[PDB]
């Protein structure tokens, strides 16, 4: 009825899909060996959303996990997050494309989609209503941006009636591998924007700027930043198995968050902002985190919310708390700041309270915003791309790999049109 087939690819897709499962298996309280040990019926009726069925409180958690190089496939099968899922979804490749978007899309990456699409054709006929396709990948890599963007088109031309969202990861100059990728970026955005519905804009330019200043983690790893992004991805999908006053299914989330005919890159906020297990924090009071959702710093996308006029401000609350104070503290913003949220929607969505607390936080929150502050994550990519391109530098890594020189020009001009589309004030 309300079934979800999940898919992910790439190193960043696989270094968060393990982090995605460990958070939701402790907020729902799921045993990592395959079983379940919980108490509430809030966490028990909704077991058919992601998961299959088997006897003895066991199942197979279906999510297509694929990359060509076998070093990543052997790194997400070690721990208790390894034996949780189906071994027949072990879909790997022969030769990993070395951060080449071209080999992951046309020459080599367009070979083993038939070993991926055959898995999706069997996880579709077993369900009864498929209510989405989710995707986690990096926007500037190899098969994470090559194969992960191609598998959208192979399913969208076969299941066009399904709302598709992608958990996007913009790259950054500070945390960087295969140092130059505005070529890998805008080729991965151009086929994304033309083929998706919802797009969560996560960048490593803001996930490193917070840790340099607020959390004081000056030199972290990917896994320290994988912890930050895996806390929001449970704060988003808590409106899928924990119902409330805002029954906020993904198709209903699609209609309630997309004003203009083209998709836009969502800029989520966060709860009070620490790492795992860190003390020295106050009680998570409701009127305090209103300033922590509308902060100019607490954003999961490096932007400027003081200038970006709000369009959709749907923020999901989690934890047993007072319903009266939630309704009052939101009215200290639109009734005082007419430029931050502006006049497009009468009675815009501003709350959805969940009672089940996350694993480690009591009375937390999850801000999900969308505004014209996402100009600056289009101008900083394009200015780093137009310096790459008006001298035709590093052009020969794609032209000998079955590409076209003038496909850059559309994907350049498609991004410049987005910025001029955002000055609708």
């Amino acid at each position: 009825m309300r079934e979800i087939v999940h898919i992910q690819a790439g190193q960043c897709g696989n270094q968060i899909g393990a982090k995605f499962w460990e958070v939701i298996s402790d907020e729902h309280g799921i045993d990592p060996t395959g079983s379940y040990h919980g108490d509430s019926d809030l966490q028990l009726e909704r077991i058919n959303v992601y998961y299959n069925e088997a006897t003895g409180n066991k199942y197979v958690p279906r999510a297509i996990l694929v990359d060509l190089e076998p070093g990543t496939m052997d790194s997400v099968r070690s721990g208790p997050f390894g034996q949780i899922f189906r071994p027949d979804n072990f879909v790997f490749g022969q030769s990993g494309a070395g951060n080449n978007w071209a080999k992951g899309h046309y020459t080599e990456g367009a070979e083993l989609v038939d070993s991926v699409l055959d898995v999706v054709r069997k996880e579709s006929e077993s369900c009864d209503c498929l209510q989405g396709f989710q995707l986690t990948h990096s926007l500037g890599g190899g098969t994470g941006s090559g194969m992960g963007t191609l598998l959208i088109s192979k399913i969208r031309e076969e299941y066009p009636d399904r709302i598709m969202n992608t958990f996007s990861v913009m790259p950054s100059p500070k945390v960087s591998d295969t140092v130059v990728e505005p070529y890998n970026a805008t080729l991965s955005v151009h086929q994304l924007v033309e083929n998706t519905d919802e797009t969560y804009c996560i960048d490593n330019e803001a996930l490193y700027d917070i840790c340099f200043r607020t959390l004081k983690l000056t030199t972290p790893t990917y896994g320290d930043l994988n912890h930050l992004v895996s806390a929001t991805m449970s704060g988003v999908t808590t409106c899928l198995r924990f119902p409330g006053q805002l029954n906020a299914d993904l198709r209903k989330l699609a209609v309630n968050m997309v004003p203009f005919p083209r998709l836009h890159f969502f800029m989520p906020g966060f709860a009070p902002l620490t790492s795992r297990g860190s003390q020295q924090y106050r009680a998570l009071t409701v009127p305090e985190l209103t300033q922590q959702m509308f902060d100019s710093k607490n954003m999961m996308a490096a932007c400027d919310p003081r200038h970006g006029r709000y369009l959709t401000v749907a923020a999901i609350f989690r934890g047993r708390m007072s319903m009266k104070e939630v309704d009052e503290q939101m009215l200290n913003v639109q009734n005082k700041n007419s430029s931050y949220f502006v006049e497009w929607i009468p009675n815009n969505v501003k709350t959805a309270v969940c009672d089940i607390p996350p694993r480690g936080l009591k009375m937390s929150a999850t801000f999900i915003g969308n505004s014209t502050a996402i100009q600056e994550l289009f101008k900083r990519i394009s200015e780093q791309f137009t310096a790459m391109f008006r001298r035709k530098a590093f052009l020969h890594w794609y032209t000998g790999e079955g590409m076209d020189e003038m496909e850059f020009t559309e994907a350049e001009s498609n991004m410049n049109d987005l910025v001029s589309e955002y000055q609708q004030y």
């Binding site: 035709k392 530098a393 020969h396 032209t399």
Partner: protein
Amino acid sequence: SITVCVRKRPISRKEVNRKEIDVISVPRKDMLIVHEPRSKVDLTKFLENHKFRFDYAFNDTCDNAMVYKYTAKPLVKTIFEGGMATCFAYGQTGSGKTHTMGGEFNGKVQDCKNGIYAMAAKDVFVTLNMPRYRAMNLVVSASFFEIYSGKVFDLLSDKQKLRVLEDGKQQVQVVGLTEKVVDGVEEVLKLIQHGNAARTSGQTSANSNSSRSHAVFQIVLRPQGSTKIHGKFSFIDLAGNERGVDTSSADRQTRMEGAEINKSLLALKECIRALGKQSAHLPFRVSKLTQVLRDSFIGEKSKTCMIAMISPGLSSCEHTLNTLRYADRVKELVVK
């Protein structure tokens, strides 16, 4: 006082099978443009145009009589004034050199009715029969060399090895060459047909009669009963540099003559530029081919006519710019 002409040759049948692109255009009477494909640093290919201006330029549809009429035909009213005159055939190998000089390549045979040797030896005799010049009572005699492995051979006699000596008046004299006395034009065609049958040439599939030696044909104009020399017309068919892709089946014998063709032309390339600047010691005695060609450059009564031969295609664009640049340097020469 050297006239320079150029002749683009047409494209063969085998070069159409390998899909060869023609880059040499002769749009006007005395111009030529080389279309050179070049790529920039960012793999953006562009095209260069190398203009040239000569005394006369030949198309690819011109026949050997038209090439004759503008090169060696004006030089017959010079040999009957006391001077001497030569003509070269300078270019890449396979570029139609012995097709112009020797004759039209009729497969297994050599149709010597064409060529510059026969058409001028005919035109000496018509000039000799005019009543203005019949009064001098001259005797036309013909000789015919071969320069192989740096040494001079002979082709009228079968294999007479020849020496290159010098008179006290600074005049090179090959001695002792065979100098038969020519009766008429039916006699001089018997020399050339017998001459080309004995010229040393390789045997392969691409160029089954490729030149392997620098053949020199002379027509000596002598007064009767004096044993002086009143005029000479010395033809020169070269062998042509070959260093592009000549790696087919070359044994120790093939590159023995192979590196000696290229050695003889570098000596010829240097004497052009040494005559270009002034007062330098003109290296005429490096190769014996340059010692024969001494009287062509610094002759006080010498009127030469170099015919620069050009292969048309794309793969020979490198040799083409090499060959055309020397002929422009040959044109810009003032000896005395």
